[PDB]
DNA sequence: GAGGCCGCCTGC
DNA sequence: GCAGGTGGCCTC
């Protein structure tokens, strides 16, 4: 029944290869595609290719499969074309008993005309490789053969674990007690003597050291003790050393034992780690170390990756434009002596790629564009962007740019029906002028916080995000990246995500899509935001940036479960970072004090940029005039609750005096009085009531009566308050050692984000300190009125955030071509 | 316009 | 129960 088919192409130990075989009446060869029943008859028929013929002298025939992935294993679930299947890196020898029968698939190559195929409207197939695990879809590798039964899954599986293990290559002396090497590997990083090295903060140590509740009633509800926006949860940032020496234990026999790889490294001080601690780095440049005499012996394992540290006065070149020129690069001027607790000179020992063209919609003042300026990668020569404040903020900040003020459904009409310039005469971008797509389509229907998202948008074939993804379908750009509030990948139980990225595999992108945190590319804000990525055919599909700040934890949860399967990014630095945190300090303790109302458009500084954050952000050339330093004008009664709003980290509304206070309106703030009684929340230590709503008990209803009118303590917090989580953070201050929570359109203290007010001045943060929270440049100009200025500001993406997106899409353009 | 008011889901 | 959400809508 089974015979092979000639003689044994080679001959191992217990097995014999063949080249082709026959069983029944179908013959296959290796590089043909079968299917298999699975080992439990309910699920549908695995598909493979062949890889490998043989039989073994103990078991039966068998035969090497390289399985494919059907599209509804992947996360497209059942949106996936039936006929679609992905390349994965999964493979095993089986038996050909199990083989069901041949099956033709065919490999859907895009065309050498893609880039033009947009805009125009029975068989296996295959066109993209799957990542599992990252949910990233990539061109199929170039893997080539010398392999006479390759398989390219156990090809790059191999290659896989060569990179991940830890190697020493060039030795150097052999010792007494152990060996020692010039260079290792590890990671696909090469480690050198006298190269730095991250590690893990606990690698090495350093050798350095009832309230009044008739007055205050609502301060009960504070029980919970979690300060919210606070930084004493956040991971420390890597230990750095210099790499002394690579050594590996030698056996008794002389020889090494190259499976313990060790390395002697010196101490670096981070200015926080001296004896002056936390307050040294203020203002201390974040990449700035202190050379030290103290060493330690860690695992070559525990090594998280490779960073220079150089000595500054040797430099060629400043240290801020060796700073800027690069990663991971860190600096010192002195060393620090521990013992002594004191700074000395350190020992004489210690010593032409063309931008993308980019089209922005959506896009705002400009945050995404400026980002990816700063990244080198990118010219913004067109943005759509409908709303017409914005969109003169975007031309004020990018003189050279064409700003169209359309909806970008009318634009994308003309250009698909022939058009050449809009109705203010100005030239639309054609097919091949559109190098990369990028854009943060409106985010209103996907918060969390739109309680009525049900109203006026539920139709995806009409929705925003099909406008723009009927833009990269048109225009066919070698990137593209879509942005929007983490909420995003799961709206409709995560139907949006997963027809986007169907969308994306059926125009022949690679894509991809993950969830990043802003806080940890260097703003002092916690700000989730979904990312979809994708690439061109041709290019290399960029991964994620990993992450520059350690983050307080809690902000930090990046995974997206969709039907059941949880997905992670590409990103390893999971719990610490090459850099520290940065705090509401670091934002804006160098900002003139400005009242409630503040109107001033250009006032002075009154002083240097005090923190490395201020001064990237300040920028090289002196600024004479800080401008848009202006608050919203609260009214009366909220202007008195902000002025009874304590300054100790995690004072919010519960923290209100029950008083009646003279307003400046000449008007009267009155006094909240508790009315009916809540059995779940009690009765204070005066035996007064906590209810102030006859919603409170049973299944009541809401009746007029009991609703009270302008109370210092607003009426509506303690009125819904216990399913609220205690409504924690409204009227809230910002604390010095802090982050913002996500700054928004309109910074209002009774809004869902409500920790606004400044940490010491009665008022809301500033347009400029809202802008400082997002990274933006004090020079980037804002247009409108003030409320115009806020919503530019909370709807742009973080500066720093695209900044470490754009410079992974530039290794991209590097390692293409 | 400005302030008050305040649902539901993911994730734990 | 706890924590988070580039906010909408309603009334004056
Ligand atoms: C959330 S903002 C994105 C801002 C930008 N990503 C940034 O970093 O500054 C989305 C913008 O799209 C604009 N918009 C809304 N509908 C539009 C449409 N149909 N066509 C063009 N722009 C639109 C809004 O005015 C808003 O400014
Ligand atoms: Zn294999
Ligand atoms: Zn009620």
């Given at each position: 029944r089974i015979s092979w088919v000639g003689e044994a192409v080679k001959t191992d130990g217990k097995k014999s290869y063949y080249k082709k075989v026959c069983i029944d009446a179908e013959t296959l060869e290796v590089g043909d595609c079968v299917s298999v029943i699975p080992d439990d008859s309910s699920k549908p028929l695995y598909l493979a290719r062949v890889t490998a013929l043989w039989e073994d002298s103990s078991n039966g025939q068998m035969f090497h499969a390289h399985w494919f992935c059907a599209g509804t294993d992947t996360v497209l679930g059942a949106t996936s074309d039936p006929l679609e299947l992905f390349l994965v890196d999964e493979c095993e020898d089986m038996q050909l008993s199990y083989i069901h029968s041949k099956v033709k698939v065919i490999y859907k190559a895009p065309s050498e005309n893609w880039a033009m195929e947009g805009g125009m409207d029975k068989t296996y197939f295959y066109q993209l490789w799957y990542d599992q695990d990252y949910a990233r879809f990539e061109s199929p590798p170039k893997t080539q053969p010398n392999k006479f039964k390759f398989c390219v899954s156990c090809a790059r599986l191999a290659e896989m674990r060569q990179k991940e293990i830890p190697r020493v290559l060039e030795q150097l002396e052999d010792l007494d007690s152990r060996v020692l090497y010039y260079s290792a590997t590890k990671n696909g990083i090469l480690y050198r003597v006298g190269d730095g090295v991250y590690l893990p903060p606990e690698a090495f140590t350093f050798n350095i050291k009832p309230v009044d509740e008739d007055l205050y009633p609502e301060h009960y509800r504070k029980y919970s003790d979690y300060i919210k926006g606070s930084n004493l949860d956040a991971p420390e940032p890597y230990r750095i050393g210099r790499i002394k020496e690579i050594f590996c234990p030698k056996k008794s026999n002389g020889r090494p034992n190259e499976t313990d790889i060790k390395i002697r490294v010196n101490k670096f001080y981070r200015p926080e780690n001296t004896h002056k601690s936390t307050p040294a780095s203020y203002h201390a440049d974040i990449n700035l170390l202190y050379w030290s005499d103290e060493e330690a012996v860690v695992d070559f394992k525990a090594v998280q990756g490779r960073c220079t540290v150089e000595y500054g006065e040797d430099l060629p070149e400043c240290v801020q434009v060796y700073s800027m020129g690069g990663p991971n690069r860190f600096y010192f001027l002195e060393a620090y002596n521990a013992k002594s607790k004191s700074f000395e000179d350190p020992p004489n020992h210690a010593r032409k790629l063309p931008k993308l063209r980019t089209l922005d919609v959506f896009s705002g003042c400009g945050g995404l564009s400026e980002g990816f300026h700063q990244a080198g990668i990118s010219d913004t020569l067109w943005a759509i962007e409908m709303w017409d404040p914005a969109a003169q903020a975007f031309r004020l900040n990018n003189p050279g740019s064409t700003v169209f003020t359309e909806d970008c459904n009318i634009l994308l009409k003309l250009v698909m029906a022939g058009e050449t310039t809009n109705s203010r005469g100005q030239r639309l971008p054609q097919k091949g002028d559109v190098e990369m797509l990028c854009g943060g389509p409106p985010c209103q229907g996907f918060s969390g916080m739109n309680r009525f998202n049900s109203r006026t948008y539920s139709k995806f074939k009409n929705s925003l995000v099909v406008s723009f993804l009927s833009y990269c379908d048109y225009y066919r750009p070698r990137f593209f990246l879509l942005e929007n509030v983490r909420n995003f990948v799961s709206f409709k139980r995560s139907m949006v995500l997963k027809l986007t990225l169907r969308c994306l595999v059926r125009m022949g992108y690679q894509c991809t899509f993950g969830v990043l945190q802003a806080g940890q590319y260097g703003v002092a804000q916690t700000r989730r935001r979904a990312i979809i990525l994708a690439a061109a055919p041709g290019e290399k599909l960029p991964l994620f940036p990993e992450p520059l700040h350690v983050f307080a934890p809690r902000a930090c949860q990046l995974s997206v479960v969709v039907d059941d399967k949880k997905f992670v990014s590409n990103i390893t630095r999971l719990s610490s970072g090459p850099f520290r945190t940065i705090t509401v300090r670091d934002t804006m303790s160098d900002l003139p004090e400005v009242r409630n109302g503040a109107s001033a458009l250009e006032i002075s500084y009154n002083g240097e940029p005090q923190s490395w954050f201020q001064r990237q952000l300040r920028g090289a050339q002196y600024q004479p005039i800080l401008r848009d330093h202006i608050c919203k004008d609260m009214s009366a009664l909220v202007a008195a609750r902000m002025r009874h709003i304590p300054l100790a980290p995690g004072s919010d509304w519960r923290d209100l005096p029950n008083i009646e206070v003279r307003l400046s309106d000449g008007t009267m703030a009155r006094k909240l009085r508790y009315t009916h009684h809540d059995r779940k929340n009690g009765r204070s230590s005066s035996g007064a009531?906590?209810?102030?709503?006859?919603?409170?008990?049973?299944g009541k209803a809401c009746d007029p009566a009991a609703r009270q009118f302008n109370t210092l303590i607003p009426w509506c917090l303690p009125h819904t308050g216990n399913r609220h989580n205690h409504w924690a953070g409204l009227y809230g201050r910002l604390e010095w050692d802090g982050f913002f929570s996500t700054t928004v359109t309109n910074p209002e203290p009774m809004g869902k984000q409500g920790r606004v007010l400044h940490p010491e001045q009665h008022r809301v943060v500033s347009v400029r300190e809202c802008a400082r929270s997002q990274g933006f440049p004090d020079t980037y100009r804002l247009f409108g009125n003030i409320l115009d200025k806020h919503r530019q500001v909370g709807n742009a993406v973080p500066p720093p955030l695209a900044k470490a997106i754009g410079l992974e899409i530039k290794l991209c353009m590097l390692a293409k071509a």
């Open positions: 009531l906590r209810g102030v709503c006859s919603c409170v008990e049973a």
